[PDB]
Structures are given as C-alpha cells and as structure tokens.
C-alpha cells in the first residue's frame, strides 16, 4: 500500500513495442507544481516511507 | 544519473534546516541557456548569480 514511483525504459532500437503497462504514470508531479503555490508555499518539508 | 544515489544526503541536509532548491541540467547545454536567459529577468539573473 505504499505510494508509487516511476519505472523507466532502457535504451532500445525502434519499432519494438509489445510489453504493456495498464498503469497510469505519476500524474501528480504537475499537480504538486500547482499545489505548492496554490497553498502559497515557499519553504516546506516532504516525506516518504522506507520502501 | 539515477537520482537515488543522492537521496540519503537530501534527508540530513534538509535536517540541517537549510534552504535549497533542486534543478536538472538537460542533455543539451545551449538549449538550457536558451531556456535560461529568454526567461531570466533582472531579478532572476540576480538570484542566479547568487
């Protein structure tokens, strides 16, 4: 039940795509870009668990 | 670079209680300065030489 980080793509030749992902990305980074100024924050502290 | 190699130092450096921003340098340099000075204002060029 931990929060979700991103997984990447190692470099590969083109025209090569079968391995599927039914999962949306981390779509809240831009939401955080909004919200740390929509809450009008200048300086603040963030946290994340062990895993 | 994989940013997890620095994520431990972020913690205790934040626990020094300091004031630090974090920025990426992209793969092309002249495009970075293109994105800089076209949007750098006077106050931005001031805080950037700081």
Curated annotation (Swiss-Prot), chain A:
It is found in: Postsynaptic cell membrane. Member of the ionotropic glutamate receptor family, which plays a crucial role in synaptic organization and signal transduction in the central nervous system. Although it shares structural features with ionotropic glutamate receptors, does not bind glutamate as a primary ligand. Instead, forms trans-synaptic adhesion complexes with presynaptic neurexins and cerebellins, regulating NMDA and AMPA receptor activity and influencing synaptic plasticity through signal transduction. In the presence of NRX1B-CBLN1, forms cation-selective channels that are proposed to be gated by glycine and D-serine. Belongs to the glutamate-gated ion channel (TC 1.A.10.1) family. GRID1 subfamily. This is Glutamate receptor ionotropic, delta-1. The gene is Grid1. It comes from Rattus norvegicus (Rat). Homodimer. Interacts (via extracellular N-terminal domain) with CBLN1 (via C1q domain), and more weakly with CBLN2; the interactions mediate the trans-synaptic adhesion complexes also with neurexins and are required for ligand-gated cation channel activity. The chain holds residues 122 to 172 of 1009 of the full protein. Glycans are attached at residue 10. Highest in the pyramidal and dentate granule cell layers of the hippocampus.
């Amino acid at each position: 039940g931990s929060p979700r980080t991103a997984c990447h793509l190692n470099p590969s030749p083109d025209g090569e795509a079968y391995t599927l992902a039914s999962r949306p990305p981390v779509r809240l980074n831009d939401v955080m870009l909004r919200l740390v100024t929509e809450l009008r924050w200048q300086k603040f502290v963030m946290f994340y668990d062990s895993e | 670079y994989d940013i997890r190699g620095l994520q431990s130092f972020l913690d205790q450096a934040s626990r020094l209680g300091l004031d630090v921003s974090l920025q990426k340098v992209d793969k092309n340099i002249s495009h970075v300065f293109t994105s800089l000075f076209t949007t750098m204002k006077t106050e931005e060029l001031n805080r950037y030489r700081d």
